[PDB]
Amino acid sequence: DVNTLTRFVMEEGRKARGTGELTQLLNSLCTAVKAISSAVRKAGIAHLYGIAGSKLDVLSNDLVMNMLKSSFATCVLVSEEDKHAIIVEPEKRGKYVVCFDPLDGSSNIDCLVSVGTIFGIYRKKSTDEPSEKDALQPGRNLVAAGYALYGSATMLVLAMDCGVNCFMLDPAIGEFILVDKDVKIKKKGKIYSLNEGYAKDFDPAVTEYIQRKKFPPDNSAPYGARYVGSMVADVHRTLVYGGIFLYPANKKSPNGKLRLLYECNPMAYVMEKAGGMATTGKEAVLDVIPTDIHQRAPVILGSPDDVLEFLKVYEKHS
Amino acid sequence: DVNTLTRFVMEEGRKARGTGELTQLLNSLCTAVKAISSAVRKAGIAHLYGIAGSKLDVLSNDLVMNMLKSSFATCVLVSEEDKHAIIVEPEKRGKYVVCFDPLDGSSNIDCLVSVGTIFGIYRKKSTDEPSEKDALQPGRNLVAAGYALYGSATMLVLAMDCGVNCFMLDPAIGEFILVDKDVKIKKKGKIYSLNEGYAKDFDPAVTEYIQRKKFPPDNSAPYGARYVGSMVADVHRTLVYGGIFLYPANKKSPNGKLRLLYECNPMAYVMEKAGGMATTGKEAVLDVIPTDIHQRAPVILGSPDDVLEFLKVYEKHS
Amino acid sequence: DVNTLTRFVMEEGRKARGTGELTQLLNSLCTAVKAISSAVRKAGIAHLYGIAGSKLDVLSNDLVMNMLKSSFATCVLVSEEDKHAIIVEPEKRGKYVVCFDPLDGSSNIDCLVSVGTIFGIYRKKSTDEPSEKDALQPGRNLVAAGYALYGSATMLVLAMDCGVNCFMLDPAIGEFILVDKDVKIKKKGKIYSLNEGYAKDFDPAVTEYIQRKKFPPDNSAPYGARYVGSMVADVHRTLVYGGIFLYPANKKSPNGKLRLLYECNPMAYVMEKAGGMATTGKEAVLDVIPTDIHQRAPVILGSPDDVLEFLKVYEKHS
């Protein structure tokens, strides 16, 4: 028997007997993304091109942002869209907190390459007035999360304590359908993805995890150099065919490029529920403690071996 | 002053004062697409998942077929699905042979990695009954070509005499609007793409060109990798932003991969009309003669320069 | 601000500190309706004309149905499309009997006429192995009922205890947005409606009331005879402007021709919760104690003024 995303959140919701906030949250959440696909595949582009007579990295926010402030179950909402933090209003408050990237893969969409909404639904901790500090928290506290990847199709994977369930998106009616009941990532990939363009800047470490795949020892067989561009786009695929996403340190900074607050943590939290790791290099992406709500971070994620085989190397040159 | 594909391939019709067999290929084909275009976002997935009780790599094949078997401007069509020649019916005879790669990078859709639809439009020469041969012509005689990119959005590219333009699929009115006029790529891009996993079967003419990007000879910023995996998607970015795609020989068979008539042939064309070159290495693509509708070949195309730098590094090992 | 149907259901649900069976309930209906429209508007229509290579009274039903067993809150269901009462299975069963017309207009849909779906939500009172007996209930024992409409656009009105509320269906994302709050109704209207030709069997009041409008005794602006014939559309109209709707008695049966449990029971519970009136002519509809689930009844309704106006005459002929 079937199950719409907007419903299993009702069931589990009952199943736990809380406030209801989280519910509206998800359903708020959900509808926010259905409203971004519409703009994602260029909605009525017809009008803005002259089919009657007489800007995307924005709607995607101007929507979610609103969907939650207005959701009524929020206090402090972060985002790779505002240098400073947004604080819900006295009337529109709720005991939850949200971090997120409204649309990763952004500018790389001119070439219609796949993008998607990423997010972290952490929980507030004190009676102190909510504030940007509320977000400042370690991945693990995460009370739920997941992301929406609008690519070939419009899949939105959800990631709660009860695991992770794949809810495809029949766009013909306007509702998600559960398609991949409670997941878990394969054991060993046979694909490794990391932009290999800045190899010069790659420490020796990385160097060989790429040179022990291309010219593996056990005279096995060479993984793939696949890597699209957007994280949302790769990560996922990696949790399907299995594999490994590498995005480490170099010239720029030791903390690499990628953001911790919203682009990392979330995912790190999905690999870990599907049974995958997520070491930062010296520890776990989900354990690290936040300084600035835009803090940067390095991340390696993928199957158990494609990171234990990894971590193994990384130390050798340490 | 707004315009839709139909109208486009409508207008050019007049200037030419013809017979109506091109404008009805193009049209009748634009339709089969919007369909695959809705069959990919998992149109009505619900219905087949429980909602009321009780395939692409295929559902798509048809759509072009039947839509072409009934255009009447077709004589004999070939596909990445039906082996020998689909020899059109006496009643639906046309003066053009279509060579199409229905759904590209399809088998990698479970992952929602964008995908496209490739297609080359030629014309019969002989007088003799229509068979595989009538479609054994080289992409230099092509009179029409392009493809559709089923990604974050949907864009199709229509190449022919005059030039190249892209149309956007406003999913709210099933129509394709030309978004850019007579587009051309850049001279020397900053991107390279190819499965860098078979680096260990690679042939030198290429093992230099690679070390020739990550570690350029004049301390100038290194380019950037990226290789979505499903061609159509990859090639496209290579267009919009410019750069170089490569899918060379190795040890699979210097036949390499990518299909001639309906994968390489058309892609070279477009490229070649937007100011680029698409070479096999030992000669430009749109020359290489066709023996069997299923002949492969290795192709490197895009921003002319890279293609050139490349074409160069080649000989240094010949 | 901004509201949907699915989150308004949630906000009431919250404020009511309920059990969680209703909110889930109405969420399983909403869904089925949403999946219906796509069919009414001939979704996979051309696919039928083999564009790729190749009965609604039911499907709808089948939907509201199934999705309704699956809402985990039902024990007995009844429709204009299922002879005997349909008893839910042990597991799934839930404290809410529901009745409904899977789609009123079905027949003359060949004119592509405005149609819909009705639904009477009764809470089971007695206590035994769920059987129609409970389905055997009058309109006033209800806690929810109403409808959704198929016409120019898609609207799903929902009236309970709190009030009427209309939710439009955005074809871009698939969700119902609140279009007009606590929908009330004109004390009077200038629009009466009914099957004008059956004046052959018009019991005095009727034929009279008729000529009480066509030619008003007080020289008033003669009413409009807008008869659509297909409940939904008809009814709904009245709510937006006002007037009077009737499907009277005669040689047909001293009891209309519209079943009572799911075609007058709900609709009544709406005309009433909006500020209007409903009647059988002798008595008030909702106050009828239903015998055979498929019993009928004459139904008069619309703005008060007009009803009681008629009603009066009903006595001048008693």
Place this chain on the structure above:
Amino acid sequence: DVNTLTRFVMEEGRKARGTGELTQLLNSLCTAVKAISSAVRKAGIAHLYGIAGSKLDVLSNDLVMNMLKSSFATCVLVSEEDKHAIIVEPEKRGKYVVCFDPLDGSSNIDCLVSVGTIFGIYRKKSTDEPSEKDALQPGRNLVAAGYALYGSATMLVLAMDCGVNCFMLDPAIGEFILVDKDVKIKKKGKIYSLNEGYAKDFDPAVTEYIQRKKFPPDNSAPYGARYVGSMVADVHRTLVYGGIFLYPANKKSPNGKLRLLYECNPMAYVMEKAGGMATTGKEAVLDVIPTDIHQRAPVILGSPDDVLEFLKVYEKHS
């Protein structure tokens, strides 16, 4: 086989051997009707009511227009929504003049009732610079015409030389599927149609015809009454179910109510062409000589036999 509105006319175009404005004309229109289609089902109603962070007539009029002129097929454009007439710029000219009622059902599109579009097409008559004088022409003079009704579906009924052919919208891909290959109306109909409140301002004739059916002169089945008000919503329903359409003079005045050029003559051409009858009860609708745009008229239409009855009874009260 299959058929799309576009490929129904592109086929017709070939044989025809004409210019191509017509094809471009219709096509451009076809698209114009799709453009509105979405709009009708309140395509973005989610954005206008808040979901982001913050009247239909003119839009539907704006449309058709900016594309008709932009179809390089027009010249003199008449419309129910522009005082006089609009004269295509000198540069975007054509030969065919077009009369269309952008959207009918506008002062009744609150209750959401079925509203559609009707249109006629005359080929320029004067070598004189495009003015209304030009558009002034008899309905017979019509080169083409037809309509599309936004009902349970967005169907299209196109009237041409051939006959009349229908098209139902598949809002998933976006096309007009040929559904009922060329139609004709019944010989006998059993459903009369009209606003019977204007019963006080009816002339004895029109009056008595309602009488012979309200109560047969030969007690065989007593005709059924229907009437949505909306011009298209009915004539159509008439064409599928046999019946008769009346809207003669009354209190307004002995001339009519419905505009000739676009709310009659087209529907007139349609009725006849398919295979029925048309009259003003003063002479064949179309044949009427124009004396100005908004020129109303008395209109009886539908099935021969019934359009025919009315007549013997019309030359009676005379």
